[PDB]
Amino acid sequence: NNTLYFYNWTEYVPPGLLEQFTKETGIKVIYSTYESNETMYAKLKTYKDGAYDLVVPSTYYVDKMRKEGMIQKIDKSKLTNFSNLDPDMLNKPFDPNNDYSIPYIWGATAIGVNGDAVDPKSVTSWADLWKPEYKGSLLLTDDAREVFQMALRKLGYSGNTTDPKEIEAAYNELKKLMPNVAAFNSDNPANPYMEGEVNLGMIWNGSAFVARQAGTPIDVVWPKEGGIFWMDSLAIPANAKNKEGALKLINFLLRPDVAKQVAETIGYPTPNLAARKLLSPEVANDKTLYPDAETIKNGEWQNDVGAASSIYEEYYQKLKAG
Amino acid sequence: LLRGGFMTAIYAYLYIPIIILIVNSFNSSRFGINWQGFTTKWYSLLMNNDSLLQAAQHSLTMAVFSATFATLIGSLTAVALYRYRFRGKPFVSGMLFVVMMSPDIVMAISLLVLFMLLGIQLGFWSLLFSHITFCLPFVVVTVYSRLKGFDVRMLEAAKDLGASEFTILRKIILPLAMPAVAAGWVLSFTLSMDDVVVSSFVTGPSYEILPLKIYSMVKVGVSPEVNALATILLVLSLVMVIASQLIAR
Amino acid sequence: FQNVVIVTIVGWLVLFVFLPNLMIIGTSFLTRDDASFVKMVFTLDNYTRLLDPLYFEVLLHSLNMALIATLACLVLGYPFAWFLAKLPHKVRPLLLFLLIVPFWTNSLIRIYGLKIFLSTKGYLNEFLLWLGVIDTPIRIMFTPSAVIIGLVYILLPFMVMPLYSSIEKLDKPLLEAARDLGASKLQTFIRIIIPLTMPGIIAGCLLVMLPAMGLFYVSDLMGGAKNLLIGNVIKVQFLNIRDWPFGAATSITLTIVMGLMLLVYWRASRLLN
Amino acid sequence: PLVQLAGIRKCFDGKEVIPQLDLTINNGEFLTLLGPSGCGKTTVLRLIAGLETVDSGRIMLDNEDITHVPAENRYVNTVFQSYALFPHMTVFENVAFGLRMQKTPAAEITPRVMEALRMVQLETFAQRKPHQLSGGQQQRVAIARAVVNKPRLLLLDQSLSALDYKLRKQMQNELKALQRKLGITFVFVTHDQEEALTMSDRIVVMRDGRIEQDGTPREIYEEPKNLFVAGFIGEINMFNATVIERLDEQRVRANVEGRECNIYVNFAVEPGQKLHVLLRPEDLRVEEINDDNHAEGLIGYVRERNYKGMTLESVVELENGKMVMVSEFFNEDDPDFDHSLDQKMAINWVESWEVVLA
Amino acid sequence: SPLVQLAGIRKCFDGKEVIPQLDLTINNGEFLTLLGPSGCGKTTVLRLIAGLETVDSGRIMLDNEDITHVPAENRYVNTVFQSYALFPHMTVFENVAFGLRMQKTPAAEITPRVMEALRMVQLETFAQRKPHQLSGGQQQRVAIARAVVNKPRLLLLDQSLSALDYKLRKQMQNELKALQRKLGITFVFVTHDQEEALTMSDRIVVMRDGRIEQDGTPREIYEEPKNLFVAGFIGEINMFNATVIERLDEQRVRANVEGRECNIYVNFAVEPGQKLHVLLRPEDLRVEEINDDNHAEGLIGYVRERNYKGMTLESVVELENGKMVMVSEFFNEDDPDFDHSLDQKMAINWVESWEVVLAD
C-alpha cells in the first residue's frame, strides 16, 4: 500500500495513464519532469539516498551511471512481460544482458519548417542554417549532444568522438551560428512554431506530430548530412524504498494495449514490437515517425563517449552566454 | 476626464491576463491561443489528478502553519516595542527595515548553505523556517503601526488602578490589536501561497508544493488544468478576506 | 515576558538573517570540490572570472533591464498615486483593495497568460488586425521589450503603496503657503513636493529594482537566449553545474547595490526630520 | 479705503457659512475679527488672501477688481497658525523664497533679507534649520517671511496662540510697534477677548457669518448693542426687570429681582414692559451686614471667593437663586480685606453705570 | 495632622540629579499646589508619591506606615493625567468600574457606586456612551470620576485643566473647589499658571531646580516675597536699584533710588553704602501726567504703550534712565474714562509703606 516517485521526461505520460494504474494495484504515484540529461544527473546526486524510485535515463548514460553507482540490478523474473519487446534493439554494448535498463521509447530529430512562411524545399541540409539570411530566428534544442552532433556532421566527422581536436573544431564553428539563435527550448519545441515566433529550426519528430494533429503544417525535412537518433530506457536508482513498486510499473508499460494508447496520442515511435502492429494507418505509416531502412542507416545514433563528457558540456555552457 | 482615463488604463493593464486565465479555463483548445467553444471537461479532469491535488494540499498546510506562527511571534514583538522604551530600539527598527529590504535570491542561497552545513535534510522543516523568516517583518510593521495610534499613558493608568501585568494584556492591549492581528495572518497566508524563489531552492522531492509543479506545466504549456486550479484558489482566497473581517470584530 | 521577547527576536535574526550572509561572503573565496561542495582553500580565482567579458556583459545587460523597469514604475505610479489622493474618502478603500486582489492568483500563471496576449498569432494581434491599424503583426517575444513588460506588470503595486503614504502624509498648509508667496504649479512641484516625498521614492526603488534582478521566470517564459537576468545565473550554478563558490560570488553584485541604495535612504531621511 | 467687500457669499458642502457681508477696510489700521469657534473668520481671511474663490460678490483693492485674480498675483501675504516653515531650508532661504519667485535681481536679495530679519531680531540665526529654533523664533521667521515682499495687507491667523503667558505679552507689544513702523493694515483673527481688546484699533464681532457690531474697543465694552456682544467679551450680569411707572425723562421706576428702585433708561417705555439690566462685575459695590438692619440693596449671600492677587472675586447668590459674581479692588483705605463663606451680604451699584435693553 | 511625609528623598535620572534633597509635609483636609517653571521636577515628585517611580534614598510615609516599597497597586493614592488616559473601547461605565473590578468588589455593590460617582460630576445620562462621542470637558470629567470612586486618601492631579478653553476652565476651577470641600480629602495640584495657583489653592510650594523656595498661604507669597525669583514669578514686579545714604529714624532710611532721594521703609539694620533692591507692583504706582513744567515731584518718564483691558489700563512708561516700568491703574474710582498719548510726559510716585526692600 506504499507509493512510488516517478521522475520522467516532459511529454511522455499523457493525462489519465497514471490514473489507470492506481485503480488496479492500490498504489499512488507522484510524477515530476526533466528537461535534459544534465538536469536529471544533478538532481540524483544532490538529494542522494532515496529521493526517487524510477528514473528514465538516456541509453548513453546507462553506462556512465553504472560506475558512479546510481543504478542497481533489475530482478528480471517478476518482469513477466519482457517478451513482447522488439529483439532487434535488445542487445547492444551499453547494457549487454539487460540487467540495468529496459527500452522505453526511441525517436529522431530533424529540421522542421513551416509551410505557410518558408518553402520546405529552400532548406535541405544542416549547413543552410549557417546562412547569414536567418539572423535572429532559429529554434534550437537544449541538449549538449544534439547541438554538437550537427557541426561534427557538417565539417565531416563521427558524432561519437572523443578527440579534443574535433570537439574544439566544433566549438569554433558552432559559435558562428549563435548570431541566428533566438530560443533554446527542450520542453515543447513545438510551441514557438504554434505561437508564431520561429519558422525554422531543430525539432523533435514526435512533437511535430502533435502540432499537425492541431492546426499547423510543420514538415520534418530530413537533412542530407544525416539525422540524429536516440533511445531512452527505464532504470531503478540504487537506494529506493518501493523496490517492488518500481518493477510493477515497468511491467505495466510493457503491455501492448497500454503502449499503444500512449503511442497514438504522443506520436513518438514505440520499440514495443507486439504493439508496433496494432496501430492506425496514420501513426504506424508516416515517413517521419517510422522511417524507411535507408534513412536510419544514413544518420548516426547517439552512443557513449566515456570520459570526454565534460568537454562537450563545458564548451556548451560557454556557448549559451553570448 | 483624462484623469479617469489614466486610472482606467492601469487597472485594465493589471486585469487583462486574469480574465484570460478565466476565459481559457472553459476553452476547449488544449493550447489557448484562440477560442474553440465551451466545455467543462478540464475541471473534471483536474478532480482526478493526484499529483496536483497533493501539491495544492501541501501548499495550503504550509501557508496555514507559517502564517500562524509568524503572526504570533511578530505580534508579541510589536507589543514589546510599543510597551517598552530602551536604548536599542532604533537599532532593532533598522534591523527590521534592512531585513524587509532584502533580495529573495540571496535569502534562498543563504538558507541553502546554512541547512547544508548543519546537516538537516531538505523538506518540510526547512520550508517552514524560511516562510516564517520572510513573513515576520510585515506582521511586525502592521501590528506596531496599529498600536502606535493610541496613548501609551493607558498602561500607567491601568497600573495605578490596581492591575497586574498580565491583566493588561487580556483586557486592554489585545482588544485594541485584534483588527491588525487578523490583517497580518491573511497577509502572511497570501505570501506563502505564491512564493516561488525560496521554495525552488529549499525544498526537496519529499514535500512538493504548487509553484514547482505549476512551473513544469507552464513551460510545457499543454495542460489547461492549471487555469482551472487558479480560479478555484481565487474564490477560496476571497472567502478568507471576508471571513476574517467578521471574526476580527 | 520582559526580556524573552527581545532575546528570541534577536536570536532569530542572528541565526537566520545576518550570520548566513557572512557565510555567503565567506564562501565567495573558497575552492570548488565535488564532495562537500567546498574545500577549505583560499583563492581569488572566482573574482577574476567575473571580469572576463564573457561573464561580464551578462551583468551589464541584466542591470539595464532592471533600471528601465524601475524608471517605468516611477513614471506611471507617481501620477496614479497623486490622483488617488484627490478622491472622496469613501471610495479610497475600494480602489486600493481592487489593486491588491491580483496577488491571490498565482503569479506564475499571470505571466503565462500575458505570453498568449502578446504573441504573433494570439489576441491583441488578431483583435488589432481586423480593426485596421496594422498591416503585419507585432512581434514582441524573445526581445528585451518583453522582459521589461513582465517586470513592470508584477512589481508595479510595490511602487504605488510606498508613494501613497508619503503623499497622503504631507501637510496641506505647506502647499498653500507656497501659493501665497508667488509659486506656480511647476515650482511648487520641483522645490517642495519632490524633496518632501523623496524618502518615499527611494523606498519604492528598493522594492522594485532588487527583486527585478531575481525574477528568473520572466526571462524563462519570455526572454529567450539573448535576454537573461542575474537570477538565472545563480540558479544554473547552484543546481545544474554545482559550482557553489562561483554562484555565491555572483550574488555579491546584488548586496553591493542594496548597500548603496540604503545609504541614500538614511541620508535623505535625516535631511527632512 | 484699501479693501472693499460687496455682497460676498460662499457655500461649503451645501451648508452656508457666509450669507452676506459688506465690510470696508481702511489704510493704516489694526483690525481684529473676534468670535466663537468656527464662525467663518477663516473663510473671509482666505478669500482676502486668495486661497478660495467666491460664489457671488466683488473684492476691490484700490478700486482694481481682484475677484478672479489668482492667489499668486495679489499683493496680500498670510501668516499661518502652524508656522508653515518648510523644514529643509535655512532661515535665509525661507525668507528669500518670495523674492526668488518674483524674479528679483540677485544683487539685492541679501540686503533685503537681512533687513527683514533685523526687523524681528533674528540677525544671527541666519543659517539654522527650522527645527533647532524654539517656538517664538519660528513665529518670528514666519512673520519675517510674510513682510519681506512689501505687501499691502498682512493677515494674521491665530498668530500667537501656542506660546506661554509671558511671551504673548511681549510679542503683542512687539507686533504693535512693528505695525506703526511699517505703515500697512494688519488683519487679525482671534478667539480671545483680552488680546482683542489690548492689541486693536477697531473690532468687528462676528457670529455665524454675520457682523454683529463694528467699532472701537471703548464702544463695544462700554456701550454694547445686544446680549451676545455684551457677554462675549467681559463677564456680564443680566437682571430681569419689569417697569411700573415713569419718573422723568432720565429716571424710570421698576422692579428688579424683587427690589423696586429707579433705573436710568433713555428710550420710550410703557407700563408692564419687560427690560434687561446689565452690569459689569467691577462696577458693583458690596457691603457686609452682621447687624439686624437689612436694607439698602438685595440680600444675596456668598458661595465662593478667589484671591486674584490684584483683586478679589466673589460669587454671590440672591434670594431667587441667581449668581452675580462681583469683583473688588485693593485701595489704600482697604488693604488685605477678605471674606468668609456664607456671609450675609448687601449688593448695590453705582448710579447710572448700567445699560438697559429692549 | 500628618498624612504624607517626604523625609530626605533623592532621585537621579540618566546620570543627572533632578531632586537634590527635599523635605516636605502634607496635611489632611487641605489643597496644596506645586508651582514652578517647566521641568523643575514637580512631575517627578508627583510620580514618586503615586508609585510609578521608585526612590534612591529616603522614606515616604502615609499614616505612620512606611510605603517606600509598596507598589502602585496597594497604596491608597489615585492620579489624574494630562491626556486623560482613557480606554477608547470601553464605555464610560466600564471606565469608572475598572478600579472596583480590580479590587474584587461584590457584584451587587458596583452599580450604585458607579452611578454616584457619575452623579457627583454630572454624567448621569452619558453612562452608556463610549468616548469619542464626548467633548473634551466630558473626558476630563470621566477621568476625575474614574479616579475618585475607589475612595483614595489623596487625589493627585497633573496640569489637569490646561487643554480646555477659557470660560470652561474658569467654571471647572470652582467645580473642583466644591468637590474638594464635599469629599474631605487632600488635593495636590501641579500647574504652570500663576492665576490658577492663586485662585484655588490653600497652600503653595514654589520649586526651582528641586529646591523648595517658599511655602505658605497665597497672600504670604504675593505680599511677602522672600527672594527675587518668587517676587518676579507670580505676578509682575518692578525691580529697582538703590544706594543707602544714612538712617532717619527707627523705621525709615534715606536712599538714592534711580537718581533722586526719597524716604523708604527698611525694617532690618542698615549700614551706608550697600546695595538695596526696591520691589513695587503695578498695583501700587500712582501716576500723574504733567503738561507744562508744573508739579514735577517724583521720577520723570515717557509713555510708550497703552493697553486697555476693560477694567484697568496698563501703560509701559520708560524713564530717562532708559528703564521700562509697568503701571496699572483702574477705572473703579470716580474717573469715568481717560487715555494717554504716545509721547506724554509723566510723573511716578508710590504709596507709603507698601514697598518691599531686599538686601543682597
Residue numbers in the entry:
A (entry chain E): 26 to 347
B (entry chain C): 5 to 253
C (entry chain B): 7 to 279
D (entry chain D): 16 to 373
E (entry chain A): 15 to 374
Which of the paper's sentences describe this entry?
The PotD-PotABC protein complex in Escherichia coli, belonging to the adenosine triphosphate–binding cassette transporter family, is a spermidine-preferential uptake system. In general, ATP binding, hydrolysis, and phosphate release trigger conformational changes in the transporter, leading to the uptake of extracellular polyamines. Here, we report structural details of the polyamine uptake system PotD-PotABC in various states.
Thus, the PotD-PotABC complex was formed by incubating the purified PotD protein with the PotABC E173Q complex in the presence of Spd, ATP, and Mg2+. The architecture of the entire PotD-PotABC complex reveals an inward-facing conformation, assigned as the pretranslocation state. Notably, only two pairs of hydrogen bonds are formed between the PotD N-lobe and PotB, namely, the main chain oxygen atom of Y56 and the hydroxyl group of T58 in PotD interact with the amine group of K217 and the hydroxyl group of S220 in PotB, respectively. In contrast, the interaction between the PotD C-lobe and PotBC is more extensive. Namely, the residues D212 to E222 in PotD are sandwiched between PotC and PotB, establishing extensive contacts. In particular, the residues E220 to E222 in PotD interact with the residues K127, T126, and R145 in PotC through three pairs of hydrogen bonds. We observed one Spd molecule bound inside the PotD. In the pretranslocation state, Spd is enclosed by the N- and C-lobes of PotD in a tightly “closed” form. The Spd-bound PotD in a closed form interacts with the PotABC complex to form the entire PotD-PotABC complex in the pretranslocation state (state 2).
